[PDB]
Each structure stands twice: as structure tokens, then as C-alpha cells.
A paper describes a structure:
Ribonucleotides in DNA cause several types of genome instability and can be removed by ribonucleotide excision repair (RER) that is finalized by DNA ligase 1 (LIG1). In addition to RER, LIG1 plays a crucial role in Okazaki fragment maturation during DNA replication and completes DNA repair pathways. To maintain the integrity of double-helix structure during DNA replication and repair at the final step, LIG1 ensures high fidelity during a three-step ligation reaction: the formation of DNA ligase–adenylate intermediate (LIG–AMP) in step 1, subsequent transfer of an AMP moiety to the 5′-PO4 end of the nick (DNA–AMP) in step 2, and finally, a phosphodiester bond formation coupled to AMP release in step 3 (35). LIG1 attempts to ligate the RER intermediate following RNase H2-mediated cleavage and fails on the RNA–DNA junctions resulting in the formation of abortive ligation products with a 5′-adenylated-ribonucleotide, 5′-AMP-RNA.
We solved the structures of LIG1WT and LIG1EE/AA in complex with DNA/RNA junction harboring a 5′-ribonucleotide at the nick. We captured LIG1WT and LIG1EE/AA structures at step 1 of ligation reaction when an AMP moiety is covalently bound to the active site residue K568 of the ligase. The overlay of LIG1/5′-rG:C structures with previously reported LIG1 structures in complex with nick DNA containing canonical, mismatch, and ribonucleotide at the 3′-end demonstrated the significant conformational changes in the AdD and OBD domains in the presence of a ribonucleotide at the 5′-end of nick DNA. The AdD undergoes a drastic conformational change, during which the active site residue R738 moves ∼18 to 20 Å to form a salt bridge with 5′-PO4 at the nick. Furthermore, we observed that the formation of salt bridge by R589 and K744 kept 5′-PO4 away from the 3′-OH end of the nick for proper catalysis. Our structures demonstrated that 5′-PO4 anchored by LIG1 active site residues R738, K744, and R589 led to a conformational change downstream of the nick DNA, which resulted in the narrowing down of the minor groove and widening of the major groove. This reduced interactions of DNA with the OBD and AdD of LIG1. However, LIG1/5′-rG:C structures of the present study showed that the 3′- and 5′-ends of the nick were stabilized by pi–pi interaction between +1G nucleotide (3′-dG and 5′-rG) and salt bridges at 5′-PO4 with R738 and K744 residues. Furthermore, we observed that F635 and F872 moved further away from both ends of the nick. In addition to LIG1/5′-RNA–DNA structures showing that ligase stays adenylated at the step 1 of the ligation reaction, our in vitro ligation assays demonstrated a diminished nick sealing of 5′-ribonucleotide by LIG1 during ligation when we observed relatively efficient end joining in the presence of canonical nicks.
Author numbering: 262 to 388, 395 to 748, 755 to 900
The structure:
Amino acid sequence: DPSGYNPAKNNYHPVEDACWKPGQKVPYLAVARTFEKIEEVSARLRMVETLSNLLRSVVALSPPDLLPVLYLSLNHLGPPQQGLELGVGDGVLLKAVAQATGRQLESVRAEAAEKGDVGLVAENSRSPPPPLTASGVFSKFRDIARLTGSASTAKKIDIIKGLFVACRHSEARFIARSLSGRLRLGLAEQSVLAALSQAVSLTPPGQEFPPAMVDAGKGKTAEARKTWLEEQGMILKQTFCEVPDLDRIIPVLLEHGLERLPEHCKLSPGIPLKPMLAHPTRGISEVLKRFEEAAFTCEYKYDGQRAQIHALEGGEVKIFSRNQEDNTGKYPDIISRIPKIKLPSVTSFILDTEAVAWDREKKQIQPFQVLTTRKRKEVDASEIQVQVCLYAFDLIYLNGESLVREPLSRRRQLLRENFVETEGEFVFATSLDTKDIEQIAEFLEQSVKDSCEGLMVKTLDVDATYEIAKRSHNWLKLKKDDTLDLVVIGAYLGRGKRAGRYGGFLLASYDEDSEELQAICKLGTGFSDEELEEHHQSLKALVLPSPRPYVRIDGAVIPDHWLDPSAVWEVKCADLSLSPIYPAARGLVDSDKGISLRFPRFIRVREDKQPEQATTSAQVACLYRKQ
DNA sequence: GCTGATGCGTG
DNA sequence: GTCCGACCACGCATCAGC
Ligand SMILES: *P(=O)(O)OC[C@H]1O[C@@H](n2cnc3c(N)ncnc32)[C@H](O)[C@@H]1O
């Protein structure tokens, strides 16, 4: 009976405590019940142990189902480079829920909005189908993803409808949450990998049934078992960091075990790697304190796309994003300039660059906003209007050899010798090797004058290995980063923990000339759970049927609930930006723009102030001009 | 072909 | 103070209904 499956129990037996038989398909109810127990407890150690217990049972009884269970737990359809997209959100899902239940769409939409979760609407509104299996549900997910073109939505909903029909207990709750993209399991790539290494360590794969070894850490002490499990997890995470492909890792892991996995999987071009990231710093003094005496280089903080350029032995080139998505079609201009950025001796590499929009007429750098207007579909180079300049700063791979273990001085050296620069097309990142504080400060202000967001600071020899998929403390960011009183003119219904309350708010400034409230930004950060739920009734009493005549929101998202302009909030923001969406001070700085708040954050309520005493739109334009 | 609703990516 | 999972804003992209 899969409805009683308790993978959170102590002394879990991968065979006797499982809700299915050997050689039999893993039921999806076992996965859903694993999701329930993971969410009921808060200790992330117990959430990993509960997921491992399911994986141990999968490994022991139904090994071919390990890959679908992992992807279902990660809410992914496959390898990130494959580019498989469901094309399903809340809109298609509620249409399927209303169609399966025979209810109207607005009644289902009203319920989904009030309860805040679409999975609760599908579960409660339940409307003889065989029991769902893990690989069966996963195959239906990939089937929904393959449907494209005209009249594909109805075909997607039909697959979803048949799923909701076969759903029992909490299966519909987690299928709807997964299809909406918000599974909210509490575990992701780090925790799912942790549970997998624990599973194959406790219940080794490749055994004859019945498995003679079910708890390999039985006689170990608590510390010894913890130490042995921590190092086994480091083997899997180190191998997966270099080969982030579950389609490749899992088959070899099941056949040769975890300890022999590094001998079969090696870093090579063609498989995208999660790039190295940096930690923010609050100033140059913190940089030198954290770096102690380690020599560092100062690099420009570029405002573009992190592009991983893979050149395969033979001549094939692929461009990958930071999220391991293939962008080779988005950049045909970069593909055509590959032969003129390297020496003839270069036959294979993995480049770590920054794709920055380039004004070829002015020989200047354009902001990231101009880069986002680039077509992302299959473009041809002749129609590219926003050219890009490549800014390389690291070399992961060169001519069959990996350089992740070499220091940055060795990697930067091999990058400057084997690659040739072309102005406005491919150049090395503007760097400066120095220890003088005054020289770093001038380099930083220079960086801003060249339309960059600051400085990247990286160690050169001490702790200077390329750390894949890691936000390192050996890379530091020297970035450039106002209090305003805005009127709450609308509310947005919340999800997740804010399901039954408000999750966002539409703020507005006061325009003195037209005597109108102009929307300026959206706000949902800076709130404690207490001051949100304890004050949600105060804003709920301000709900208006229709917006006031003096409220102007223009192209901003229409709020779910219009609120009577009466609440004035003190809001802090990193900086101000020109927005083609918000109408606040539209014609006071630019002719057809307006000013919004970048990363706003709630501070306090200003009950002493009234909407007409809020920060004026002229005051907003003055703050932007002072930037 | 147009429009509005809808989905997706990444810094 | 560090790690981790979840979220997002604004751009392009996709599609239902006409
Ligand atoms: P900011 O907090 O906006 O983050 C900047 C991101 O861009 C990457 N990046 C820009 N420029 C470089 C260089 N020269 N070297 C390495 N990384 C760079 C950062 O890693 C951040 O992801």
C-alpha cells in the first residue's frame, strides 16, 4: 500500500519497508509520499535522509527508475543543454483543472488565487485508471514538452487531464506544482546529489536480489558514519561538477559504483559547466583583509552575459550559458569569429568570457538592456543589430588538457599566449595587477567611466584554482552599490508561504503637476512574516472595486486588488533606473521613459504621512540626476 | 496579421 | 558568516481566437 509509505522512519529497510516489489515499476505515490515527509520536517539533514531512503529502495528493487525519480525530484525534464521546455504555467494548468472537474475557469482561478496553490485546487477537486508510475509520469512530462505549434495547448491539457484522473491521495498536488514550475520541495541539485551518494553508499548498486548489503554503515559510530558519508558525497559532487549530466553519470554509477565513477567521467568540451562565481565585498579594505597577502588581479566587472565557449576537437563550437543552456544559435556572429581569436596550434578549448553589447560605430560598450533585445531564436548573422564584443578572462580547457587545477596565473598566461585580440570583437578583460590601495580605487572609478559595474578581484596563485559551480571567496566583487516614501496603490496575491495573503504591492509616487499617483515599482521584500500577516487585514480593508481616477499605472502589471491610496511606506532601493513600463516622472528626465526603483525593500510604515505628502515625482527625477 | 494572454531565461 | 533553495524583472517567444 503506497499510501502508507514512510521513508522518514528510522531503521528504514530498502526492501521490506518499500511499497513495491523487486523488478516492478516505482509508483508515483511513493515519490509523492516522499515529498510529503520531506516537507513535514524542517531539518535539512532529515530531508536528505528521507530522500536517500527512497533512492535506496529504487536502487535495490527498480534500478531503471532511478533517473526518472531524480529528475522528478529536481523538477527537470532532462539535461539542461537539451533545452526541453514544458510550455506549461498556471494558465494551462488551471484550464486542465477546470476541464477535468467540469468547473468554470474563473471559479478555478478564484480558488487557485485564494488558496495560493494550484496543486491544492487539483487535489481537493478530484474527478478505473491504473496506478501512476514514476517513469510513466516523467514520460508524460516530456510528452507535454514535445508538443509545440498551433493547437498544442489542447494536446498538452489532454495529457495533463489524464494524469489528474489517475491521481490518488497527494499525487495531483505535486504533479500540478511540478507542471507550474514551483515544486517547492526544499531540496535541489545540492541536496538531491547528497541523498544519491548516501543511497549508493548505504545500499550499494549492482547486487543480486535479495541485496545482501542494505546498510553498509551499520557498525560505524555516529562520527565515523558521518565522516564516511561526507567524503562519499564529495566524490559524487566533484565528478558531477565536471560532468553535469545525469544521463551520463547515473548509468556508470550504477555499473561500477561511486568510487570508480571518477575513472569513467572526465571533463571535456561539449558538456556545459556551471561557471565560477564571486562573493560581494563592501570595499577594498575587506578585499585585502580576506586576501591577506595573496597576490590578486583587478578585472573589469562587465555587464553582459556569462558565455562559456566550447571548441570541440574537430571544429565544432558551442556556446553555453551560466545555467548550462545552449546559446549557440543565439550567437552566430561569435561562431564566425572563432577562427580569428585563436592561434593555429589551438585545437580545443573551453573559454570563460563575458558577452557585452558593442556599439561598433562609437567603439563603445552598451548596457545590458541593449543586449537583452538580441533575438534568442535561431538568428542569422546578417540580421544581428546588437553586435557583441567578447571579454575573455579564464581558460578551463586547452588542447586536450584541463586547467581547473592550475592557478589563475597559469590559466591567464595560457589565455594570453594562445588567443589573439581583435578590438570590438574579442579582447582580454581589462586587468590590473597591483597592491596599492590608491591604484585599485582609481581602477574602480575608471571601470565605471568605461560603462562597467565595478571590479572583479581574483587571486593569482594562492587558492587560485578554477572552482566549477561554486561561489568562491577567492573571487570578489567591488560593485558600485535611496530612501523614498511611496503610496501603496495596489496589492498582488501571494504564493508559497504568502498563499492566503498578499505577496506583492504596487507602489507609487506623487506627481505635483497633475496631482496624480504614478506607479514607480513593485514591492515584496523587506517584510517579516509577522508584520505581513498581522497587517494584511489593514490593507485588505482598503480594497477598491475600481482604481481611483488620479492613479496612473500605465504598462505596469494591473494589481489583483486595487487599494485605496492611504498607506505611505518608507522604501529603500539600491539605485534608480529608467523604465519603459512605469509612468513615474515619465517626461522629467527622458522623453518617453519614466523612473523605477531597482531592488526596492520595505523599511517602515509612515502613518504620519498622507498620499499627497509622499515623495514627489520631481524629487524622484532629482535623485536619478544625482546618480 | 493582430492582439492579448501566456511561457521562458538569467543577471 | 556560510550554504542553499526559491524568487524575480524585463526582455523575447509562443499561441488562442478572431
Ligand atoms: P554583479 O554583481 O552584477 O555580477 C557580475 C557578474 O558577471 C560576472 N563577471 C563579469 N565580469 C567578469 C570578469 N571579468 N571575470 C569574471 N566574472 C565576471 C561575475 O562573475 C558575476 O556573475
